[PDB]
């Protein structure tokens, strides 16, 4: 039977799924930016090694 509590559960499930997906994509973006920063740092280090040598 259709009950406001059942609709509440359905809405909660949908919202939890959407929020979890958003959080996962945000974490992926943050990890990508961290990788880019580390890559820039070690590329600068490699350039300095090439220049000094």
């Amino acid at each position: 039977l259709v009950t406001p509590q059942r609709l509440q559960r359905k809405r909660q499930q949908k919202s939890l799924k959407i929020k979890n997906a958003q959080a996962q994509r945000e974490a992926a973006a943050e990890y990508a930016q961290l990788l880019a920063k580390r890559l820039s740092e070690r590329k600068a280090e490699k350039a300095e090694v090439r220049k000094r040598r």
Partner: protein, 260 residues
């Protein structure tokens, strides 16, 4: 036996639960959980025996059921939960917080440790792998699977889980000259500094450890848990700091520090 075994006779329980060889035929078998049962510690043992807050099984059941035990920020209402090494046990009653660290005799000693640092936990990295969709992840000794770790975190390393969000806060890189703890064998509870780590191509790494008293031993790498930098441990080490005083030195401690 055809299938899993679900009973632990009292003599077969580890000598670190260090129960009474009489007054019972069986011993609490730890349920499946974050730690090996040989290395873990059931909550019933920690409360009934170590703390004496309870008296027997029913009292421990009543304690756990009403949600006063909090293992690493979670309730864990099962009697034989394997609260293992470096886990945090919180009792809002008596507002007390414990962290399980071996005392140098090699046993899960009762370590009353402050609320402020009880927020976080330490962990050893046991695996670093790449799960589905190319997502890096790290498996600690608790079995915690931390997703998206720092790119230069390697195996055998140590990490500082915030224990609230359950994400990575800081980490310590394994290398020589570093404060370290031991979690197996004769050197249980010992704390020292890594002097050398001989590789031994083909398996079973070994590390040499020198403690503050300038004593030296050697232990397996699986057996090793980096705990911080010398002079600056990242946690509150228990009483004695794991120096492993000699039996004669322990006798001298009993004689000297003595007031009745």
């Amino acid at each position: 036996a055809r299938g899993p075994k679900k009973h632990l006779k009292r003599l077969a329980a580890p000598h670190h639960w260090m129960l009474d060889k009489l007054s019972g035929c069986y011993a609490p078998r730890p349920s499946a959980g974050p730690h090996k049962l040989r290395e873990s510690l059931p909550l019933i043992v920690f409360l009934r025996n170590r703390l004496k807050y309870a008296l027997n099984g029913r009292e421990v059941k009543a304690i756990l059921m009403q949600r006063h035990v909090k293992v690493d920020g979670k309730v864990r209402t099962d009697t034989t939960f394997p609260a293992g090494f470096m886990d945090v046990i919180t009792l809002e009653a008596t507002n007390e917080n414990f962290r399980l660290v071996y005392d140098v005799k090699g046993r899960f000693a009762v370590h009353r440790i402050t609320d402020e640092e009880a927020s976080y936990k330490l962990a050893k990295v046991k695996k670093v792998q790449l799960g589905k969709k190319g997502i890096p992840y790290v498996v600690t000794h608790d079995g915690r699977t931390i997703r998206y770790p720092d790119p230069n975190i390697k195996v055998n390393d140590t990490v500082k889980v915030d224990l609230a969000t359950g994400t990575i806060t800081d980490f310590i890189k394994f290398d020589t000259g570093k404060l370290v703890y031991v979690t197996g064998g004769r050197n249980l509870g010992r704390v020292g500094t890594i002097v050398h780590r001989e590789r031994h191509e083909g398996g079973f790494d070994l590390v040499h450890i020198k403690d503050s008293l300038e004593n030296t031993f050697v232990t397996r790498l699986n057996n090793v848990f980096v705990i911080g930098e010398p002079g600056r441990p990242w946690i509150s080490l228990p009483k004695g700091k794991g120096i492993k005083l000699t039996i004669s030195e322990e006798r001298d401690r009993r004689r000297a520090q003595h007031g009745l």
